[PDB]
Structures are given as structure tokens and as C-alpha cells.
Amino acid sequence: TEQFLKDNFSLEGKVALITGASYGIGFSIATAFARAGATIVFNDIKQELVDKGISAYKKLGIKAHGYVCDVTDEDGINEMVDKISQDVGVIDILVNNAGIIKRTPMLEMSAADFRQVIDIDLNAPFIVSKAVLPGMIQKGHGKIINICAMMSELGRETVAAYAAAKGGLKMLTKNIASEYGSANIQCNGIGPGYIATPQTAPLRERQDDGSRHPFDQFIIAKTPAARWGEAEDLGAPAIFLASDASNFINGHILYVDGGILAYIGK
Amino acid sequence: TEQFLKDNFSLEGKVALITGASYGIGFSIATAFARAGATIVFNDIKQELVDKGISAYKKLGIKAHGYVCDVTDEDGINEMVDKISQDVGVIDILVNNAGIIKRTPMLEMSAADFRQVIDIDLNAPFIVSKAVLPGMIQKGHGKIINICAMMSELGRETVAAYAAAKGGLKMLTKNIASEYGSANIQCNGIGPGYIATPQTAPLRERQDDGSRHPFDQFIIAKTPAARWGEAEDLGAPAIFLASDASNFINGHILYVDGGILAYIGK
Amino acid sequence: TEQFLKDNFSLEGKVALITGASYGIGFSIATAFARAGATIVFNDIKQELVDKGISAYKKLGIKAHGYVCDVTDEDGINEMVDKISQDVGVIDILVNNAGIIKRTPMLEMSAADFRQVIDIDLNAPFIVSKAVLPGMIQKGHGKIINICAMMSELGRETVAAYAAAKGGLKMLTKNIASEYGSANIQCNGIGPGYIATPQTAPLRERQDDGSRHPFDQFIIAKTPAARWGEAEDLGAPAIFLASDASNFINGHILYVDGGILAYIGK
Amino acid sequence: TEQFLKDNFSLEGKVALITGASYGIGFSIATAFARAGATIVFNDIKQELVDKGISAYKKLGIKAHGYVCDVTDEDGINEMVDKISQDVGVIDILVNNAGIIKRTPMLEMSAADFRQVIDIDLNAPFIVSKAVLPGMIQKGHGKIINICAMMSELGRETVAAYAAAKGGLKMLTKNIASEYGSANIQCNGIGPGYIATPQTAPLRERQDDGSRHPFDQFIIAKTPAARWGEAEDLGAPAIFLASDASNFINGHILYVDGGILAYIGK
């Protein structure tokens, strides 16, 4: 049964690009990919982080390829993509792990600032997808996986309209699946729930009487799983989405939330 | 055909409580109600606003009943409710127009602050509903209308978990409809789109070359209606929800958005 | 307050085409329209029905214009449309009330039969919409209302794929709203619940012991409204959708179901 | 990387009950489970089928345990369950593969017939779930997987109300996930698309000119994947749902549809 499990879930002989994965969530997702036989490629805006990245991967026994590129840089990404496509080879899997916009109150930011985020920052994951599609098509099999922002992510300002950008993960997932599914590309999403991170570690701090932090207690009650998400919880689900096992799954958002959205359906 | 239009859409001889409606959106919704024959009752946390309220209604030729109550005040609301029920009579229609929480970054606020918002602030619309149900049931017909925050509302911090409170409009709408529909109560919601307010008037400011503000231009492109919402757009829809015309409609969210959510469905 | 109620909800000086409305549901919807000041136009495949139609309308004190056309007839509908546009004038409101396909088991029907239903029968409401859009646009205001099949409709065979036709109400609603909302056309739907009809009157028959029919009892328990829908329940909601009151509502499915879909959300 | 792939996706030392899986879909799902190290248990209403079952499994090199039970038989299932729990041991995984009701037109069937389907036939998957929960809880880990009827399944009569039964997969999935997620049970669903079966093989028959059957051609156009589903496509997805890899996934419907639902979202 080793061969069966390998046939369906293995990522052997496949190049996987996971944007931003020099730490945190993208990182532990790439970690899981590597451990399933994938070749890891990732990026970040500045060199120091990339290095910290590779070091961190190495300590786990992973040879990662790390580049310096802004995901929002149009020409930059394309260069990074075909540069990967020689140094490392054809990208089989793209994990869009994009977000965390410069948090400037929508009334403080100038027209210049809007023009930027609307035209560039929000189109990032589309740019990166567009950059890697021609290859995947050539080779006859692609996996593009879009990771929605986790429900843990604090400080996000709700902007309903931004869901209508051509970038923007729920939209993008569905259009790429529709337009490019027939060239054997599967585009899907991960919807992470309340994933514990050091950022939200205060919201778990035990009280002076040793009772649970109020918010921590809310999350536990309202999550049927009765516990926070851990980054590791997204690992396997993401392989599944990157492996032959999900080849007839397209345009679907997989929610890794301990069933909280389902509790919101009673 | 005057009698027909009156039979289905009139709000004559019906008491309507619209929380917070001393200005802005709740105000223009109450304005429309009055003009359809309703009796207006509203509240606010402090007296000066209530007065400004009544003045504003009067100038339009509307006698409004204005009380001073915090929507979040448990005992306060109940008092306000039966006090209305003698001075003005049985509340037929409740318009929950609740939101705009003290915008303190979720990492700055203490456990005390969370304990408050989780247990009190988020349960407000449930408290106010609970306070007015026994009457509506007695009389044999209720309308509770929950107004989701408009897509125009800036500074809202996304907190997926808060949708699971028993207050919280999408949840509350569905439970009240389910539990109390058989006592002839119809609970539904309005989902306002990008409604122009003086707050977001900067986002409409014409540029130095006389071209459209970038964000303003986004909203127009992505809204099939090709224009922002105006408060007046919610008036009639809300009567409809408060009138005999919607008596076999329950647990439904009516979106007044110029079809932007539908564009997000391509 | 007569003028207010008229301004928002009246259908005066507006031509309304309601396909099939020579009896039943479309009929009582047209009945309500007329009573709100609309001019009624309707059709059917054969003359005898049309006549029965007009007679039925007349007895209620309504002058209806009745034509003979197959909704599926491409060239036929266009003729019927501009023929209406002279004899009666510009169609302001289109109510697509389309469905009830020849119930032949999907394995009994030949390729000829499929070719027909896929290419013609399912595109009907799109054909009729397409036929009336140029006028509505000219005049600067349209209402196209698509009436989903009621949950009462027995014998419907589930064919998930048919939702992907360009006809087909949920799809059509969203595309027309998106493409033509900016020419001030509002396209929306009614989703009728369990509407009592003489067809399903057996499912309400009291038992020999005077207890409720099992199915009748199911519907009452699972509908929060605790009763079946009546055709009349769709009347006002449909005006609302046809009146100035819903002008900033587009691409939305209004469910008139006594809150059963909401009970299915607990 | 064999140990990693085994840790997350293996079904070793786990008992899997897949109702009805003596042929067809449940069968190929069990086939895949076995090949991932699971122990297969299945049932059917009559002995001959069970035998045909075991034979079919054996030829593939699988020792299956086959019982005779009606899924709808209340007392019968419980017996079958604890009987399995000694002869085979604790059921770790339940795959509800329930449906295909006696297709009698809803107007032909008596109150007796309704009383049956409403109270018994529709509660089946709930009965079987209820029967296997106490064990899974004891052992500290359960997987209950509900397989929605495939979009391929012809002759299904649409009965919106039946979604409100406590059996009934979309409802059941969400309630079990909510109530029992905190005892470490993960309940989820598979939503199969247009899965090719010998039943619908006529709908794929090439025409006398060698062109594609009209319906076959529709499915290919409207499915972004551009091809029908095969039973094998549900195999891995179902393991994923049965394995440690999906432990923080609860109350979720996984659609294995080649992205057709997503095309219905444009």
C-alpha cells in the first residue's frame, strides 16, 4: 500500500512555488510539501528574509530555492518565473499565499495610494498565476492553490468591493478553474479558520485567576473542534490539493476551520 | 387602485421602533416609514442627539417619539420598551439598525474590553428583539427587520467568529424567523450596498484633472447599477419588509446593492 | 400618504408581459399587477386557453391583452413582442414564468429530444428577455422578473447541469443584472416556496381519522410560517420587484417561502 | 517520505463501514480505502448481492466483510453495528452512501407510503450514524462521510422539503459536525459531479455521423474539466476525508465535479 499512497498523494518530481513562504503559514505549508517529495521554491521582498527562510528550511533538512521579488512587481515576477524555470525547472504547483496590505485607514490614503492597491496590490495573485500558467499548460498538468486569509488575521479592514478584483482569491479561483480546467489545471482554495499564531498569542493568555481569555473561550465554544487551528493543520489538505488525488476537483474552496462555518449554519 | 396599494404596503396604525434613528440611515428609513403612515419611535444614548433627532423629523412634518437608551443596556431597553408600549402603544415593527463598535485594535483591548463586546455589545439586537417579541406575539403580527452594516461602512475590522454570536444579524434573522415565524412574526434583513454618505464623500472627490476618484471609479465599474447607493434606496424595501406584502417572507436577506454581489457571481 | 405609496409601488402607465399567465400562478401575479395599475399582457401556446384567460381576467374587472405564442418559438416571440409594442406599447415589465418541460424520462428521450430541450426549451426565458430589452433600454427603465419553479411543483427531475444554460433563471438573472443594470434594468427573481395548488391538494387531504396528511404535516412543521404558501403571497412581492421601490435591487433572488430555506439553515 | 505520506493519508488499522458498497460507487470507494490499508465492511438488503460483493472484492485481492441489513431497518442496523464491533472491531470510518428511493410519483403514493419515506427512508443515514457514534467517541476519533447523490443520478424527483429531514446529508453533515466535533469526530460530505456510470452510458453514445451525443456534449462544454467524472475520481478525496489529513476539517461539503458548480459561478 506504499505505492498506492504515493500514486495519489505524492509530490515527487514536481516543482512547487509558494509565494512569501520564508516564515509562518506559507512556510509550514512548503515544509509539508517538501516532506511529500516536492521541490520548494519561495520568495520575499528583501534578501535578509529569504536567507532566514533557507536557513529555517535547511535545519529541517530541506533544500529550498529562495528568490527576491515583490509579488506585486509585474515584470519582476515574470523574470523570477522563467528564471526558476531554468535553474529549477517547470513549476507544477503555485500556492498563492497573498495578502496583508499596508494597513492605512481608507480615509487617510490618497488617490495615488488607491490607484496603487486597486491596480497593483490586489492583482498580485493573478499576476503570479498568469506567469505560471503557460508552463503548466505545456506540461499538461497544473495546480494553482489560493490561500484565503485566515480568520485569525487581525486588523483586516472589510472592503466588500475588493472581492470583485480579478486578483482576489475567491474570484480568481473560479475564473482560472473555468477558463483553464480544460487544459488540466485545477485551481482551488484553502480557507483557514482560527489558526493560532504568535501574533494572536495574547488572545490565548490565561487570566490572573487561571481562567481562559474571553476571546480564547469564544473561539473554543463556537468551534465544534473546540480548539484553535495550528499551521500544521493546513499541510496535508494543501498537498491533497496539489496531488493527483484532487485532479477532478476544480474551483472549490476547502475550509480548514474545525467546522466553525458549519456552526454558523447551526 | 389606492385601496389595493394601501392594503399591501401601508404602515397605518402600526408602531415602528427604529434603533438609533436620530440621523443618517436609520433616520431616512424612519422618514420613509412615517410617510407610509407609520408612527416613528427611535432612540439614542444621549439626550442632545434625540432632540436633534425630533427637530429633524419635525421639519419634514413628522412627529417622532424619541427616547434615551443605550441599545446595549439590558434593563434599560426593557424599560424603554414597555414605556413605549403605554405612551405610544404596541410596537408592531422593530428595525434593528445596530453596529459601529468602539474601534479599538483587537490587540490593544483588555480581557475586560472583550468580555464586554462579546457578552453585551454583540448581543444588543437580540436584547431589543427579545424585548419586543412578547407584544408582537400577543397582537398576532410582528415585523423584525435587521439591517446589516452597509458595504460603505469604513473601518470595520473583519472578525469571522463574531457572526456566531446570538446577536449578530445574519444569525439572529434566521433563528427568530425559525422559532417565531409560527406566531406570525416575519424576521428578515436588509443588506445595503455601497451607500453614499458624507463620511465616504472624500472617496467621491473629483481629481485635479476632473477625472473620477479611483475608488469612486472602481465602485461604478463593479456595480452593475453603475452608481453609489443613496440612503433613500433603502426606504421602500424596508417598508415592503414591514408591510403585509412580505407576510410570507421569512429569514431572508434582501440585498439593496445595485447588483454588486451578483457581479461578484459574474 | 396616498401619493407616497403610489410613487414607490404603483405600476401605473406601465406595460407588463407575464408569460403563460392564462391561469394559475402567473395569472394571480398579473391579477395583482393590474390591481396596482398595470396593463396586463400574457400568452399561451393555443387560442382556447388565451380566451379562457381573458374571460377569467374580465370577471375580476381586468382588460387583459392575450396573444398566441410558444415561449420557445424564437421568431414567434419577437413578432409577438413588437406586435405588443404597437397595439399596447412599450413593455416595461417582463415576468418570466417559464418551465414545466415535457416530462419524458431522460433515458427514453432521443438525441433529437435532447437537442431540442438543451437548445430551445431551456433558452426560452432568455429569448423572451432578449426580445424585450431593446425597448426597455430605449425608454430608460426595465424590470425583468424571473420566477423560479415553486417548491410545490411535483414531477420535476433534478438535472444539475441544466442550471448552466444561458436560459435558466438563476443564471439569467445574474447575467442580465450584470450586463444591463447600467442601462437601468433591474433583473431579479422570485423563489416561491410550498405554494398550495389544486395539483397538490391530495397532499393536504385529511385522513380517515381526521388527522393531517403526513406530507401536509411535514410541510407545516418544517415551514416556520407553519402553513403552505398561497398564490396570492407572490402578488405584492412581485410588484415590489416591478416598481420604483426596488430600483437599487439587482440580480437578487427573493424567496417567498414562509422561511423554509432559513429553517434549512437552522 | 513514505512515513510522512503514511502518517497523514494511511487508513491502516482502521475499520471502515461503507453502506451499500457491494457494487458501483460505494464499491470503488471501498476499493480505494482497502488499498490505503483500511478494513472494508459493507452491507446490502439481500444475501446474493453481498456475495457478489465479496467475490468482486476478492478478485482485486481484498478481504471484505459483508453483512445483510436494510439501512432503513432501525433495530437491524444497531445489531449489525455491534456485531461488526466484535467480529471486526471498532468502526473508525462510516461512509453514508444512501439514497435511490422507490421512485413512485408523489401523487400515486398513499399516506402509508409517505409516512414510511418521511419517518424511515429519509432518516436512514442518521440511524447508521447514530449507531456508530458511541464507538468512535470511545476510541477518541471518528470519521463520518456523507456522499451526496451524484449529479449523474437520473430520475431523482426534486423535493426541496426533504432537505429539512434530520437524515438527509447536507443537514446531517452540519449537525453531527457541530454536536460531535468536540469529541474529535469529523463529519463531511462528498458532492460527486457528473460521474460516468453504465446507467448513463446511452447519454454518451456516439451519433450515426460520429458526432458526440447532445447531452454528452453539454456536459463537456459546461464542465471546465471537459470530461465526465469516473467513479475512481472519488477514491482519494474520500480517503483524505477519512484520514488524519482532514482532522481539522468539519461540516464541509467537498465537491468532486470537475468544476461544474464553479462554472455555474462564471
Whether residue B104 lies within 8 A of chain A, CB to CB, comes out as: no
Q: Which one, of B149, B144, B179, B181, lies nearest residue B162 by Cα?
A: B149
DSSP letter for each residue of C3-30: HHHHHHH--TT-EEEETT-SSHHHHHHH
Q: Which one, of D64, D60, D49, lies nearest residue D17 by Cα?
A: D64
Measured CA to CA, the distance from residue C32 to residue C231 in angstroms comes to 10
Rounded to 5 degrees, φ, ψ at A67 are -115, 165
Whether residue A189 lies within 8 A of chain D, CB to CB, comes out as: no
Measured CA to CA, the distance from residue A33 to residue A232 in angstroms comes to 11
Measured CA to CA, the distance from residue C113 to residue C106 in angstroms comes to 9
Locate all alpha helices (DSSP H) within C63-202, ordered by sequence: 74-87, 111-119, 124-139, 169-180
Task: Give all strands of the β-sheet with A142-147 in edge-to-edge order.
Answer: A64-68, A39-44, A15-18, A91-96, A142-147, A185-192, A253-256
8 Å CB contact between C62 and C40: yes
End-to-end C-alpha distance for chain C, whole angstroms:
39
Do D10 and A5 make contact, defined as CB atoms within 8 angstroms? yes
Give the residue carrying C-alpha cell 474601534: B103
C-alpha grid cell for residue B86? 403605554
- In Å, what is the CA distance from B26 to each residue of B63, B190, D45? 16, 12, 61
Do D177 and A262 make contact, defined as CB atoms within 8 angstroms? yes
Residues, chain B, total? 266
Q: Which of A23, A162, A255, A263 is catalytic?
A: A162
Partner-chain residue, chosen from A181, A257, A258, that has the shortest CB–CB distance to D258: A181
Instruction: Give the chain B residue whose CA is nearest to the CA of A208.
Output: B111
Which chains lie within 8 Å of chain B at 3 or more CB pairs, if any? A, C, D
Diameter over CA atoms, chain D: 62
> Rounded to the nearest 5 degrees, what angle is found at the Cα of B62, between the Cα atoms of B58 and B64?
90
Do D174 and A258 make contact, defined as CB atoms within 8 angstroms? no
A103-112: long-range pairs with CB below 8 Å, 24+ = A103/A155, A103/A157, A105/A157, A105/B154, A105/B155, A106/A157, A106/A159, A106/B154, A106/B155, A106/B203, A107/B154, A107/B202, A107/B203, A111/B207, A111/B213, A111/B214, A111/B215
Diameter over CA atoms, chain B: 62
Q: Which residues pair with C157 in a beta bridge?
A: D157
8 Å CB contact between A182 and D225: yes
Task: Give all strands of the β-sheet with B91-96 in edge-to-edge order.
Answer: B64-68, B39-44, B15-18, B91-96, B142-147, B185-192, B253-256
Q: Which one, of C145, C110, C149, lies nearest residue C241 by Cα?
A: C145
8 Å CB contact between B249 and C241: no
* 3 state SS of A132: helix
Chain A residues in contact with B171 by the CB 8 A cut-off are: 264
Chain B residues in contact with D265 by the CB 8 A cut-off are: 265-266
Measured CA to CA, the distance from residue A178 to residue A195 in angstroms comes to 30
Q: Which residues pair with C191 in a beta bridge?
A: C255
8 Å CB contact between D45 and D55: no
How far out from the chain centre does Cα D211 lie?
34
* 3 state SS of A157: strand
Measured CA to CA, the distance from residue C56 to residue C66 in angstroms comes to 12
Whether residue B264 lies within 8 A of chain D, CB to CB, comes out as: no
Measured CA to CA, the distance from residue C18 to residue C11 in angstroms comes to 14
Q: What technique solved it?
A: X-ray
* 3 state SS of C97: coil
Q: What is the DSSP letter of C195?
A: B
8 Å CB contact between B29 and B234: yes
Sequence-ordered list of residues with C-beta below 8 angstroms from that of D235, at least 6 positions apart, any chain: A8, D28, D29, D31, D32
Measured CA to CA, the distance from residue A219 to residue A153 in angstroms comes to 14
- Strands B39-44 vs C142-147: parallel, antiparallel or unpaired: unpaired
Convert D156-187 to b/e letters by CB count within 10 Å (16 or more is b). beebbbbbbbebbbebbbbbbbbebbbebbbb
Measured CA to CA, the distance from residue B16 to residue B143 in angstroms comes to 9
Q: Which one, of A132, A104, A133, lies nearest residue A116 by Cα?
A: A104
> What H or E segment, with its residue span, contains residue A180?
helix A169-180
Q: Indicate the burial class of D9 (C-beta count within 10 angstroms; 0-12, 13-18, 19 or more).
A: buried
8 Å CB contact between C92 and C139: yes
How far out from the chain centre does Cα B47 lie?
21
Q: How far is C194 from chain D (nearest CA, A)?
A: 8
Measured CA to CA, the distance from residue B171 to residue A56 in angstroms comes to 43
Partner-chain residue, chosen from D157, D202, D213, that has the shortest CB–CB distance to C107: D202
H helix and E strand count, chain C: 10, 7
Measured CA to CA, the distance from residue B265 to residue A105 in angstroms comes to 28
Rounded to 5 degrees, φ, ψ at A26 are -55, -40
Q: Which of C162, C194, C255, C263 is catalytic?
A: C162
8 Å CB contact between C77 and C53: no
Q: How far is A202 from chain D (nearest CA, A)?
A: 23
Instruction: Give the chain A residue whose CA is nearest to the CA of B224.
Output: A164
Breaks after residues in chain A, judged by C–N over 2.5 Å: none
Chain B residues in contact with C246 by the CB 8 A cut-off are: 236-237
- Please count the structural domains in chain D: 1
Instruction: Give the chain C residue whose CA is nearest to the CA of D262.
Output: C164
Give the type of residue at D64.
A
End-to-end C-alpha distance for chain B, whole angstroms:
39
Q: Indicate the burial class of B154 (C-beta count within 10 angstroms; 0-12, 13-18, 19 or more).
A: middle
Chain D residues in contact with B266 by the CB 8 A cut-off are: 265-266
Q: What is the DSSP letter of D242?
A: T
Helices A111-119 and B214-222: crossing angle, nearest 10°?
40
Whether residue A266 lies within 8 A of chain C, CB to CB, comes out as: yes
Whether residue D215 lies within 8 A of chain C, CB to CB, comes out as: yes
Sequence-ordered list of residues with C-beta below 8 angstroms from that of C154, at least 6 positions apart, any chain: C199, C200, D105, D106, D107, D157
Neighbours of A72 (CB within 10 A): 22
- In Å, what is the CA distance from B226 to each residue of B170, C184, C205, C250? 27, 9, 51, 11
Sequence-ordered list of residues with C-beta below 8 angstroms from that of A195, at least 6 positions apart, any chain: A25, A150, A151, A152, A228, A229, A230, A231, A233, A234
C-alpha grid cell for residue B90? 404596541
Chain C residues in contact with B37 by the CB 8 A cut-off are: 1
Instruction: Give the chain C residue whose CA is nearest to the CA of D264.
Output: C164
Measured CA to CA, the distance from residue B39 to residue B92 in angstroms comes to 10
- In Å, what is the CA distance from C196 to each residue of A63, C220, C229, D215? 68, 12, 6, 34
Measured CA to CA, the distance from residue C178 to residue D63 in angstroms comes to 56
Q: Which one, of C29, C34, C41, lies nearest residue C77 by Cα?
A: C41
Q: How far is D260 from chain B (nearest CA, A)?
A: 14
Do B248 and C257 make contact, defined as CB atoms within 8 angstroms? yes
- In Å, what is the CA distance from B261 to each residue of A123, B192, B193, D94? 19, 11, 9, 38
Q: Provide the annotated active-site residues of B.
A: 162
Whether residue A222 lies within 8 A of chain B, CB to CB, comes out as: yes
Q: Structural domain of residue D187, as residue ranges?
A: 1-266
Measured CA to CA, the distance from residue D262 to residue A244 in angstroms comes to 20
Q: What is the DSSP letter of C266?
A: -
DSSP letter for each residue of B2-54: HHHHHHHH--TT-EEEETT-SSHHHHHHHHHHHTTTPEEEEEESSHHHHHHHH
Chain A residues in contact with B202 by the CB 8 A cut-off are: 107
Do A226 and D181 make contact, defined as CB atoms within 8 angstroms? yes
Helices B124-139 and B169-180: crossing angle, nearest 10°?
20
CA quadruple A229, A230, A234, A236: dihedral sign: negative
Measured CA to CA, the distance from residue C64 to residue C70 in angstroms comes to 18
Mutation to test the C interface, candidates A174, A178, A266, most C Cβ within 10 Å: A266
Chain B residues in contact with C257 by the CB 8 A cut-off are: 248-250
Measured CA to CA, the distance from residue D241 to residue D145 in angstroms comes to 7
Residues, chain C, total? 266
Q: Which residues pair with D94 in a beta bridge?
A: D17, D144
Locate all alpha helices (DSSP H) within chain B, ordered by sequence: 2-9, 24-34, 47-59, 74-87, 111-119, 124-139, 169-180, 214-222, 235-240, 260-263
Helices C74-87 and C124-139: crossing angle, nearest 10°?
30
B45-49: long-range pairs with CB below 8 Å, 24+ = B45/B69, B45/B70, B49/B22, B49/B23
DSSP E strands, chain D: 15-18, 39-44, 64-68, 91-96, 142-147, 185-192, 253-256
CB pairs under 8 A between B and C: 179
Rounded to 5 degrees, φ, ψ at C186 are -110, 115
Q: Which one, of D209, D123, D198, lies nearest residue D167 by Cα?
A: D123
8 Å CB contact between B22 and B91: no
Diameter over CA atoms, chain A: 62
C-alpha grid cell for residue C224? 416556520
Convert D36-74 to b/e letters by CB count within 10 Å (16 or more is b). bbbbbbbbbeeeebbeebbeebeeeebebbbbebebbee
> Rounded to the nearest 5 degrees, what angle is found at the Cα of C168, between the Cα atoms of C165 and C171?
80
Resolution in A: 2.9
Q: Which one, of D265, A43, B188, lies nearest residue C255 by Cα?
A: B188
Q: Which residues pair with C108 in a beta bridge?
A: none
Whether residue A265 lies within 8 A of chain C, CB to CB, comes out as: yes
Give the residue carrying C-alpha cell 409601488: C9
* 3 state SS of C75: helix
Partner-chain residue, chosen from D157, D175, D222, that has the shortest CB–CB distance to C161: D222
Measured CA to CA, the distance from residue C178 to residue C187 in angstroms comes to 9
Rounded to 5 degrees, φ, ψ at C34 are -50, -50
Measured CA to CA, the distance from residue C247 to residue C181 in angstroms comes to 10
> Rounded to the nearest 5 degrees, what angle is found at the Cα of B81, between the Cα atoms of B77 and B84?
135
CATH number for the domain spanning A42: value is: 3.40.50.720
